[PDB]
Amino acid sequence: SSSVPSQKTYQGSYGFRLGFLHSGTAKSVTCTYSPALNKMFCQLAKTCPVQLWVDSTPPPGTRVRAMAIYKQSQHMTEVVRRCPHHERCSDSDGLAPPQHLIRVEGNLRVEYLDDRNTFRHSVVVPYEPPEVGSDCTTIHYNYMCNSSCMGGMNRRPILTIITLEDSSGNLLGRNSFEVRVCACPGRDRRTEEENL
Amino acid sequence: SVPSQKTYQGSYGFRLGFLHSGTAKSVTCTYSPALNKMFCQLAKTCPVQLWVDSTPPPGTRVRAMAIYKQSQHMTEVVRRCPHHERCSDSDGLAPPQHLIRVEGNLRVEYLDDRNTFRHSVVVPYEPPEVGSDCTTIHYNYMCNSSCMGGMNRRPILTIITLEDSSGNLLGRNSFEVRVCACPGRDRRTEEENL
Amino acid sequence: SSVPSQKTYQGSYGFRLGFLHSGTAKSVTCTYSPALNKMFCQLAKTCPVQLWVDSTPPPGTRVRAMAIYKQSQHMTEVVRRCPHHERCSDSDGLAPPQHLIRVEGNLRVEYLDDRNTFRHSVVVPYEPPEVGSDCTTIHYNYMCNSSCMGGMNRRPILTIITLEDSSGNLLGRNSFEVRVCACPGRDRRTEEENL
DNA sequence: TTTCCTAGACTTGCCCAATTA
DNA sequence: ATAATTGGGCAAGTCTAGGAA
Ligand SMILES: [Zn+2]
Ligand SMILES: [Zn+2]
Ligand SMILES: [Zn+2]
């Protein structure tokens, strides 16, 4: 079938695992993750921290890349991108390309790719060790379009694929989580878990 | 211009074969002998077998192209719907406007005819391997038949064309195709129909 | 031409017109009525016309189409698109915006405008029927609804299809009525019923 | 001549639940 | 448990006949 980006979990030689903040579902939450759903709920354009767990430090030049792909097989060949309303928004942080759904916050070494071959979008940052006195590395992502954006994701489930790659682009590890960009993350999360 | 769906089992005796898929609900690809219709899912493998009576010369290429089955619509270049085209992906070769792609063939070529704008994918004709009887081409349909803005629910014909390095028609075949979710349930049904 | 003749003349080549076969469905964009010898269709869509012949007209031959009002009282007036529709429909670099009738799918179209009669025509080159075909097909588009106030204004038109030579001398001639509308099928179904 | 309707019955993707191995 | 595959069924969305202003 038409090839699509790989999404299988691979801890790699460095024991790469992804972590998240345990925020709860109170009404004030801006980003909340559900361990039972392996799903992150976040508000549009707000901070979404993502934790990198490693058992041994990766080599130097190590990069961390994120990519969104549709969860359903029937839509996997579709490149996740912002709806037209959104790409057209003046919400540029000056670094990200207007069509990318995923941005990286507060990292001037941030890099964006428009795959020449797959048309696929992604964001990379250099991998940093955990801030001394720290257990893991944190990355602040932002999702720039809502799940309900007709014309975009349109209510379809998206996965965020986090890849650990050497300076040459080789795969060192991969992990993933589903995401839902919506106005009320606490409410939505509670509910979807309410269903189980 | 415009292209024919006129069989030309030619001087080589060109014929197409299809696998025996089964009718589960949502089978990936399935062909209906009675209907002469392929029923597949978007982006899924659509195997099409090439059978000749005699090996064609070298330079021979295979071309695929779609057309609306219906009279009026035959003039409308068949292409991907706006949405899918906009959010298209690719494989380093396939252009975003093409509906039909060829899977696993690093020698594939994609054409948008300058004078018809008509789109097509052509691969070289490869004689079957020693001990084989036919040659398979795997195709993928990039939009469902019901893609509003595209297929808009209208029937298409895939027309395979054997041709020489020159572009001369050496042979011709066709099949209708229905890209849908659930090719299984839909072939049964459209059979039940008779 | 003040008002070109619309008389049928198969002439030396056995020139005939052919038409597709669809019923009165709403979903039927274009539809020909043999009884009414009228063709209904809807704005901007495909109008397939079958060019039958008994004798193969020589290379260079041409097929010109022209609309004329049907009523005598309207005959001398040129059929043109309304001013509205005229300020947009110009897509397909060959078709001038005023022309009501266009042909699609032919690199060689040639639009006319009698400099002395102001009538608008779409010319094409005669072409033999497809290898295993018994007729050549032309794809016509009617650029305005017969409704266009300011355009056809509810007035019936006739399309005269002529076979002519490189010089433009007439060879054969047919014609038929056209009704550009809103969901054509019914109109025929009905047009055929008062009958 | 268009424009509304009123539904009903399909068309058709995709949910969910059972079920495989 | 655990993923993949499947079949049941559904409901958003389509076009219908059809009468009406
Ligand atoms: Zn959006
Ligand atoms: Zn599509
Ligand atoms: Zn008009």
Side-chain angles (χ1 to χ4, degrees), chain A residues 44 81-87 101 144-153:
Chain A
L44 207 197
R81 61 189 282 178
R82 289 171 96 189
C83 74
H85 181 261
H86 294 120
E87 49 171 28
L101 186 249
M144 315 289 320
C145 200
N146 310 292
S147 288
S148 67
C149 274
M150 277 160 133
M153 302 181 265

Side-chain angles (χ1 to χ4, degrees), chain B residues 42 79-85 142-144 146-148 150-151:
Chain B
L42 201 169
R79 46 160 38 230
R80 264 174 125 180
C81 74
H83 172 70
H84 288 136
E85 158 169 358
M142 309 311 287
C143 269
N144 281 316
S146 67
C147 268
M148 257 52 79
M151 222 102 292

Side-chain angles (χ1 to χ4, degrees), chain B residues 89-103:
Chain B
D89 84 331
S90 176
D91 52 17
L93 314 143
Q97 66 278 16
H98 298 236
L99 159 87
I100 313 173
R101 292 186 192 169
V102 166
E103 161 187 4

